[PDB]
Design a protein that fits this description.
The termini are far apart. The protein has a single domain (18-122), classed as Up-down Bundle (Histone Acetyltransferase, Chain A), CATH 1.20.920. The chain has helices spanning 19-33, 55-58, 65-73, 80-97, 103-119. It is built from five helices and no strands. The protein is mainly α and 125 residues long. The structure holds ligand I0Z. It is found in: Nucleus; Chromosome. Residues 16-122 form the Bromo domain.
Length: 125
């Protein structure tokens, strides 16, 4: 079976808008979301549909851009570094689970290069 997806809203976790979090939604997520190579990252890994019974045996902190998009839109975060952490967890999980030579690793590497370019211009608080 699949685990429940990561939460994108929590009534007990303080949240706010920062111009940095607005930049992460309007520029960073926006740019990555409709990249040609975005689609494997737009939702949680469905280990049932893909027949990957070991995925959630290996990956215990799953993350995906669908979850991050909802967290940004739902105002889940307190600061930009929490969101940048989620992006990096998504990339790290991909590189840990998958093998060099896998199409998904090339796809992640293209998205990560673009991610790092956009994060490099995170605005002043
Ligand atoms: C393992 C995995 C799968 C997916 C995924 N989300 C999908 C949504 C819709 C339809 C298909 C989807 N897939 C399948 C991948 C899509 C890109 C290309 N893929 C590969 O390169 C294989 C190569 C072989 N490897 C090995 C480790 C079994 C597994 C990956 C196959 C996403 N993420 C983040 C993953 O880490």
């Amino acid at each position: 079976m699949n685990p429940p997806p990561p939460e994108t809203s929590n009534p007990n976790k303080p949240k706010r808008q920062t111009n940095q979090l607005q930049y992460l939604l309007r520029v960073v997520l926006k740019t990555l979301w409709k990249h040609q190579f975005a689609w494997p990252f737009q939702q949680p890994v469905d280990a049932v549909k893909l027949n990957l019974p070991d995925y959630y045996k290996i990956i215990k902190t799953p993350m995906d851009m669908g979850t991050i998009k909802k967290r940004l839109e739902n105002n889940y975060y307190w600061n930009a570094q929490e969101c940048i952490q989620d992006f990096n967890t998504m990339f790290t999980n991909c590189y840990i689970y998958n093998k060099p030579g896998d199409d998904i690793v090339l796809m992640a590497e293209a998205l990560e290069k673009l991610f790092l370019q956009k994060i490099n211009e995170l605005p002043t608080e």
